[PDB]
Design a protein around this nucleic acid. Structure first.
Ligand SMILES: [Mg+2]
Ligand SMILES: [Mg+2]
Ligand SMILES: [Mg+2]
Ligand SMILES: [Mg+2]
Ligand SMILES: [Mg+2]
Ligand SMILES: [Mg+2]
Ligand SMILES: [Mg+2]
Ligand SMILES: [Mg+2]
Ligand SMILES: [Mg+2]
Ligand SMILES: [Mg+2]
Ligand SMILES: [Mg+2]
Ligand SMILES: [Mg+2]
Ligand SMILES: [Mg+2]
Ligand SMILES: [Mg+2]
Ligand SMILES: [Mg+2]
Ligand SMILES: [Mg+2]
Ligand SMILES: [Mg+2]
Ligand SMILES: [Mg+2]
Ligand SMILES: [Mg+2]
Ligand SMILES: [Mg+2]
Ligand SMILES: [Mg+2]
Ligand SMILES: [Mg+2]
Ligand SMILES: [Mg+2]
Ligand SMILES: [Mg+2]
Ligand SMILES: [Mg+2]
Ligand SMILES: [Mg+2]
Ligand SMILES: [Mg+2]
Ligand SMILES: [Mg+2]
Ligand SMILES: [Mg+2]
Ligand SMILES: [Mg+2]
Ligand SMILES: [Mg+2]
Ligand SMILES: [Mg+2]
Ligand SMILES: [Mg+2]
Ligand SMILES: [Mg+2]
Ligand SMILES: [Mg+2]
Ligand SMILES: [Mg+2]
Ligand SMILES: [Mg+2]
Ligand SMILES: [Mg+2]
Ligand SMILES: [Mg+2]
Ligand SMILES: [Mg+2]
Ligand SMILES: [Mg+2]
Ligand SMILES: [Mg+2]
Ligand SMILES: [Mg+2]
Ligand SMILES: [Mg+2]
Ligand SMILES: [Mg+2]
Ligand SMILES: [Mg+2]
Ligand SMILES: [Mg+2]
Ligand SMILES: [Mg+2]
Ligand SMILES: [Mg+2]
Ligand SMILES: [Mg+2]
Ligand SMILES: [Mg+2]
Ligand SMILES: [Mg+2]
Ligand SMILES: [Mg+2]
Ligand SMILES: [Mg+2]
Ligand SMILES: [Mg+2]
Ligand SMILES: [Mg+2]
Ligand SMILES: [Mg+2]
Ligand SMILES: [Mg+2]
Ligand SMILES: [Mg+2]
Ligand SMILES: [Mg+2]
Ligand SMILES: [Mg+2]
Ligand SMILES: [Mg+2]
Ligand SMILES: [Mg+2]
Ligand SMILES: [Mg+2]
Ligand SMILES: [Mg+2]
Ligand SMILES: [Mg+2]
Ligand SMILES: [Mg+2]
Ligand SMILES: [Mg+2]
Ligand SMILES: [Mg+2]
Ligand SMILES: [Mg+2]
Ligand SMILES: [Mg+2]
Ligand SMILES: [Mg+2]
Ligand SMILES: [Mg+2]
Ligand SMILES: [Mg+2]
Lengths: 67, 193, 99, 148
RNA sequence: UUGACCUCAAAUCAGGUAGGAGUACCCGCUGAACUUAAGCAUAUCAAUAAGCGGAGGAAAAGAAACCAACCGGGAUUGCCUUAGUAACGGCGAGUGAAGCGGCAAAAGCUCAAAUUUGAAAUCUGGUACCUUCGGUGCCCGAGUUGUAAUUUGGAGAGGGCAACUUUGGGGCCGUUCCUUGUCUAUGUUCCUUGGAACAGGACGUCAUAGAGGGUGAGAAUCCCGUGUGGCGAGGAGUGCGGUUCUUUGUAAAGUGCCUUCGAAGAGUCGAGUUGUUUGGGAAUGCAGCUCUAAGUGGGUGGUAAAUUCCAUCUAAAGCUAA
């Protein structure tokens, strides 16, 4: 809410309401570290979040013309 | 239970899978909306052709290295050899990939030729001027297509030197199999006296 | 280095006109850096030693290098880090005596 | 097709085709592959011999493109030449102009010798061949060229 | 005495902000058992239900400490496939990815960072006047324990010199779009039945309108609508036909050689142990405790270890539409 932060483009991204409580959702550095958010084969459970990955890999995907 | 002569099945439905059944009833609706998005985006980015120019690259993984395909972007070296800079190429419709490198002169020359063909076939509008409209063509991919390079002619002379070419595979397999043990044999012969 | 043109063997794969791309600036992060060498040598003589470094020096003097890399492999993680630390402490031993 | 099912014919008949004695229950022998070693052992050995136990050595992180080697046999091998050119290439067979067949460009990794190419010389470009494929190709007057 | 500085407080001080609701989807933590194994304890159910914390119109992820081993690809996400496969598992029941390939969409970047050192060049507030999502002046404050400019590895900076190319903004009407009003065809003609014609029969008409609904029974033609167009109204950071601030100006940004450099994230990587988790197997990830790095070196290269190479990225900081 401070205008030194609300101006100065390098930092006013923090004013976006998608950044309320980043440390409660795991969006700080230690949060993403504990969520497992890293690239590559060692992180196949956790790159897009493992509950999202689990839902993708446990969804049955049916088309109109069955495959 | 297990009963008569049937294949043993592996149907994975011992979770609550019915909470996670996606049926794609919206296939036609999402097609209508993707076409609507393409039309709306085309009208927003009038005359620009709705996709960037992509390079031709060789696909990895020896199952697929007989094919070329569209890659992500042109290679800073390819952009410089075509005669422009990367930060200006990103503004006139060329995809630039800073993280691929060239180790193939044929792929490099194909992409420099692709870039020079593109620069001859585009009309860059003046930045502040009248800029008369140049009739939007909607796709760079269908007007600079990815062509598989010709590797041989249809007919040649038979040049059989009697190498027998199955023996070539057998011998070349054997040198790889025994390279290390006989390099070590050679060095322990060298460690005599 | 140069491929042979056939599909198995030591240098298997297709013969291609090679190019040798320009060297990327990353691949140089483990750098020499005069500024950082100066900073590291100054901070080294300011901060001095660590207790396991002092145990490492007195085992190099008393027992020897092999037992020193054994206890350094225990104190650090790996044996290559143990070799690097023991070769650093040998240079400290050489510098503290010479001249 | 609900009207063609025998449920429509078992209407009026008490047990729906399941018997009055045995009297259709939930899971009378267990669920799934239960008791394949105890009460379903005869249906295992007799109709699934080899089902239980281990077989040889594990491969961690197998990529099934280290093993892409589709096999072509010489009995086909002239299908790869298109049909308009096939007739003129097998009529008046010739060295110093023999057809070049890239087998990789048609998507096979090995040539095998099933039998009897005609006696026309052919330049066969292959990643791999077998010995008898080599012998029959050279007996036709042709050559195998090794490619990668 | 007095004047600072640091740290800590107070005030119904000036301005502001948080809570709670909703919660289908989203990011986390926490977390069972019924069940299946024809018993059961590992396993499975399930990294689910319940519980708790936090968001948005999407969220998350995201421009490689990646995949690979090829003639190499190239941020992320999703679909098709990979594949019920590699692998895990009282190797029992069961579980179970990923690379490649084809598509949808596509977009790239920012700090720490350097002596501005012949300009703290930067910013909040108050006050005064205005062109009032802000600008300008002045004053107090923040700030050198570092705010601006330059630089982000793809690079880049300093110096030295042949050199050319490119100048940014602000209001009006139509127009991109949103909301909304209004206008726009043709039988209620005859006879029979009936309480009622909208029924039946006959003669017509309109149809880019014979969708639908009302009206005293099946109504294109009675009415509203429908179809096709026209005329408006009120709003949305503008693709363009004009407008104008016109010494906006030796700005700023690119591009060629030569030379010297090229800073790149620590109780972190890594290791051991414990627990959990995973398809991940002499440990896939996460966490607690203990040890604790380096600088042609750190990670990774799916069997533990020593030795020799090679290949590939550049973590321990950050943003971002579809
Ligand atoms: Mg955002
Ligand atoms: Mg973050
Ligand atoms: Mg966590
Ligand atoms: Mg997985
Ligand atoms: Mg996660
Ligand atoms: Mg989810
Ligand atoms: Mg799956
Ligand atoms: Mg379908
Ligand atoms: Mg399928
Ligand atoms: Mg039977
Ligand atoms: Mg259609
Ligand atoms: Mg849709
Ligand atoms: Mg599009
Ligand atoms: Mg290459
Ligand atoms: Mg890099
Ligand atoms: Mg002394
Ligand atoms: Mg039938
Ligand atoms: Mg009956
Ligand atoms: Mg009956
Ligand atoms: Mg009967
Ligand atoms: Mg029956
Ligand atoms: Mg009964
Ligand atoms: Mg029975
Ligand atoms: Mg029965
Ligand atoms: Mg028994
Ligand atoms: Mg078995
Ligand atoms: Mg075995
Ligand atoms: Mg094994
Ligand atoms: Mg043979
Ligand atoms: Mg107050
Ligand atoms: Mg709340
Ligand atoms: Mg949800
Ligand atoms: Mg989540
Ligand atoms: Mg249940
Ligand atoms: Mg089960
Ligand atoms: Mg049971
Ligand atoms: Mg039971
Ligand atoms: Mg049992
Ligand atoms: Mg029981
Ligand atoms: Mg589980
Ligand atoms: Mg579930
Ligand atoms: Mg819950
Ligand atoms: Mg709880
Ligand atoms: Mg909301
Ligand atoms: Mg969206
Ligand atoms: Mg986001
Ligand atoms: Mg993010
Ligand atoms: Mg990186
Ligand atoms: Mg690959
Ligand atoms: Mg590479
Ligand atoms: Mg990728
Ligand atoms: Mg899919
Ligand atoms: Mg596939
Ligand atoms: Mg399959
Ligand atoms: Mg599981
Ligand atoms: Mg793909
Ligand atoms: Mg980078
Ligand atoms: Mg009447
Ligand atoms: Mg009637
Ligand atoms: Mg009559
Ligand atoms: Mg009426
Ligand atoms: Mg009606
Ligand atoms: Mg009508
Ligand atoms: Mg109608
Ligand atoms: Mg209409
Ligand atoms: Mg610049
Ligand atoms: Mg870094
Ligand atoms: Mg530290
Ligand atoms: Mg740590
Ligand atoms: Mg847990
Ligand atoms: Mg588990
Ligand atoms: Mg573990
Ligand atoms: Mg562990
Ligand atoms: Mg391993």
């Amino acid at each position: 809410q401070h205008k030194a932060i609300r101006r100065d483009a390098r930092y006013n991204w923090i004013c976006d309401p998608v950044h309320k409580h980043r440390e409660a959702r795991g969006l700080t550095a230690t949060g993403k570290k504990s969520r497992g958010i890293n690239k590559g084969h060692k992180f196949n459970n956790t790159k897009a979040g493992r509950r999202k990955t689990w839902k993708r890999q446990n969804t049955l995907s049916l088309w109109r013309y069955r495959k | 239970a297990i009963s008569k002569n049937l294949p043993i099945l592996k149907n994975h439905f011992r979770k609550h899978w019915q909470e996670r059944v996606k049926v794609h009833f919206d296939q036609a609706g999402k097609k209508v909306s993707r076409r609507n998005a393409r039309a709306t985006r085309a009208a927003k980015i009038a005359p620009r052709p709705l996709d960037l120019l992509r390079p031709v690259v060789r696909a990895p993984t020896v199952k697929y290295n007989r094919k070329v395909r569209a890659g992500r972007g042109f290679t800073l070296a390819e952009v410089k050899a075509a005669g422009l800079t990367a930060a200006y190429a990103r503004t006139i419709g060329i995809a630039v990939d800073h993280r691929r490198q060239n180790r193939n002169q044929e792929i490099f020359d194909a992409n420099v030729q692709r870039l020079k063909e593109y620069q001859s076939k585009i009309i860059v509008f003046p930045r502040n001027g009248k800029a008369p409209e140049a009739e939007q063509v909607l796709s760079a991919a269908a007007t600079f297509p990815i062509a598989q390079p010709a590797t041989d002619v249809e007919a040649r002379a038979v040049q059989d030197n009697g190498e027998s070419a199955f023996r070539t595979l057998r011998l070349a397999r054997s040198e790889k199999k025994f390279r290390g043990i006989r390099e070590k044999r050679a060095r322990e012969k060298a460690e005599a006296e | 280095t140069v491929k042979t043109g056939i599909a198995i063997g030591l240098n298997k794969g297709k013969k291609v006109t090679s190019m040798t791309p320009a060297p990327k600036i990353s691949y140089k992060k483990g750098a020499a850096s005069n500024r950082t060498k100066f900073v590291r040598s100054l901070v080294r003589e300011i901060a001095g030693l660590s207790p396991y470094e002092r145990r490492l020096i007195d085992l190099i003097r008393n027992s020897g290098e092999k037992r020193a890399r054994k206890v350094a492999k225990k104190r650090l993680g790996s044996f290559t880090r143990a070799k690097a630390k023991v070769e650093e402490m040998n240079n400290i031993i050489a510098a503290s005596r010479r001249h | 097709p609900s009207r063609f099912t025998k449920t429509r014919k078992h209407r009026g008949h008490v047990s729906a085709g399941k018997g009055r004695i045995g009297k259709h229950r939930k899971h009378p022998g267990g669920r799934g592959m239960a008791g394949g070693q105890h009460h379903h052992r005869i249906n295992m050995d007799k109709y699934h011999p080899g089902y239980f136990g281990k077989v040889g050595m594990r491969y961690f992180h197998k990529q099934q493109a280290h093993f892409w080697k589709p096999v072509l046999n010489l009995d086909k091998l002239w299908t790869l030449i298109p049909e308009d050119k096939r007739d003129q290439y097998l009529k008046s067979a010739s060295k110093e102009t023999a057809p070049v067949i890239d087998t990789l460009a048609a998507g096979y990794g090995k040539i095998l010798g099933k039998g009897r190419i005609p006696n026309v010389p052919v330049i066969v470009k292959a990643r791999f061949v077998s010995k008898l494929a080599e012998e029959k190709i050279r007996a036709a007057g042709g050559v195998v060229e090794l490619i990668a």
